DNA sequence: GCGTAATAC
DNA sequence: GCGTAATAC
């Protein structure tokens, strides 16, 4: 059906400033099978300054050896669930050394599934996240609302002291333009009133801006996730669940927020952010 | 390799008393696939007064309709994990109505996985259990030891007021005769020193007697579980993990403790107990 | 429900 | 590790 071709990368700030930092985020949905699907040859080409991975499904002991073979991303940090083995998990790889690296959001109820790494750098503080899925039948919908409130107060406090960049799978399509089939999904995980109101309260509270919508407020059919079933990806029946939210003070540095719709290895695709620090 | 033919059923007490009650236990390892594997036609033939199922892997909402089509086992009771969906789970079906039915062992740490049903009858109190597996690599070995102590104090208190029958997957081979390959499994879940000492402390504390060993103290190669891998069952490379433990006062009623080595539908086989109440 | 990656045992 | 039954998403 309908198509989307991501525009060419703009590497120049609105004030003419050239791009310094290139961040990349990707929900790999199985880091080991992603590695097996030649996913790591792709990021070697993208050459990002920072790499954020979500849904690694891989305890820190089982990490493949080819991760230690990325000559430009040697500082690697991982978070994993306390108990469950092939579930959730996030990772943050960096070309430069972070000043401080912290894990989780400071409330033990939400820190048992390895969902958040916080990497503080010189000019800003990066946060990569993998928000809990409300799940089919919406069993975790009530829990998800408790998470969103505590995650918002956690982010609001970080931005209080330093410019903030949130990134990763946020497991919500903000608006009707952010998914292919809006009407039939008002009662499904990812496009419920409560999840969408929560994303809205996030932008308003810390505060943050959706990078992609700030540069392309009216671009439709631009998705980051496609269900493996029903040939969803070949038909571009997708969802935009992967984001880059910036502090308002960082918008003069924003050069481009990209969506690599063609990169394989996962039921998500990578997203890239160009900043000028 | 070596073989085992379960002897014919003895339905007469040592004191000449005839059999009243016929209990049956079976770790079905997937109640729905077990039903699909014609497992329920088997128990219709066995015609037991009570049926105990372990590792149902089936929440109470997803129970098949053919369970309500057992005309001789209409009183059905189920336990399931609080959160995990296709994991653990035990069930107790009965021809007669129990006086009281309780769930779990009275300590919330061990009651979140649906492992114990307690059914009090007129002459005795039946308990069916599915003991936590220490797991490959023995991650739950320390937890398993905490369970065994609390499960023993729970059983010791039940037998304090009524004769007791424990049954189900106890996830331990007591002695070297209770598994095919004793030497190579001293460091594996099911035949560790700690698990075996725990089973021993159980028999001594409440107290209880292994029905099968009381009637066949020297019968080897008699297993209830066979790994699905390595063609373990066709080679009788097995483990005796499924038991019937009685209060000492009930031994004059014991007629026979059986092992149906030939019944399919699971990587465990059913066990049957004949009592004369 | 259906595709895929990981599980416990 | 390998067979099988169930998972989350």
Author numbering:
A (entry chain A), B (entry chain A): 41 to 317
Paper's wording?
Participating in DNA repair and responding to oxidative stresses in the cell, apurinic/apyrimidinic endonuclease 1 (APE1) is a multifunctional enzyme in maintaining genome integrity. APE1 exerts its function in DNA repair through the nuclease domain which possesses both the endonuclease and the 3′–5′ exonuclease activity. As an exonuclease, APE1 digests both matched and mismatched 3′-termini of a duplex DNA with a nick, gap, or recessed (5′-overhang) structures; the matched 3′-end is involved in numerous physiologically important pathways and is more resistant to the enzyme. To reveal the molecular mechanism by which APE1 conducts terminal processing of dsDNA and distinguishes different substrate structures, we determine two crystal structures of mAPE1 complexing dsDNA products, including mAPE1 bound to a blunt-ended dsDNA and to a recessed dsDNA.
In addition, the crystal structure of mAPE1-recessed dsDNA is also determined with the substrate sequence identical to that in the mAPE1 blunt-ended dsDNA structure except for the longer 5′-overhang. Interestingly, the superposition of the two structures indicates that the two end-binding dsDNAs fit very well in the region near the active site. However, the structures of the 5′-overhang segment and over the region 4-5 base pair away from the active site of the bound products cannot be superposed. This result indicates that the 5′-overhang affects the binding mode of mAPE1 with the dsDNA substrates. Among the three dsDNA categories mentioned earlier, our mAPE1-recessed dsDNA structure shows the unique positioning of the extended area of the 5′-overhang. For APE1, the mode of binding recessed dsDNA is thus different from that of binding dsDNA with an AP site or a mismatched base pair. In both cases of terminal binding, a channel-like pocket is observed in the active site of mAPE1 to accommodate the leaving group. The channel is formed by Arg176 and Met269 in two separate loops, which interact in a bridge-like fashion (the RM bridge) across the active site. Formation of the RM bridge is induced by protein–DNA interactions since Arg176 interacts with three dsDNA bases via hydrogen bonding as revealed in both the mAPE1 blunt-ended dsDNA and mAPE1-recessed dsDNA structures, and the RM bridge is not present in any of the apo-APE1 structures in the Protein Data Bank (PDB). As for recessed dsDNA substrates, the binding affinity with mAPE1 is higher than that of the blunt-ended dsDNA.
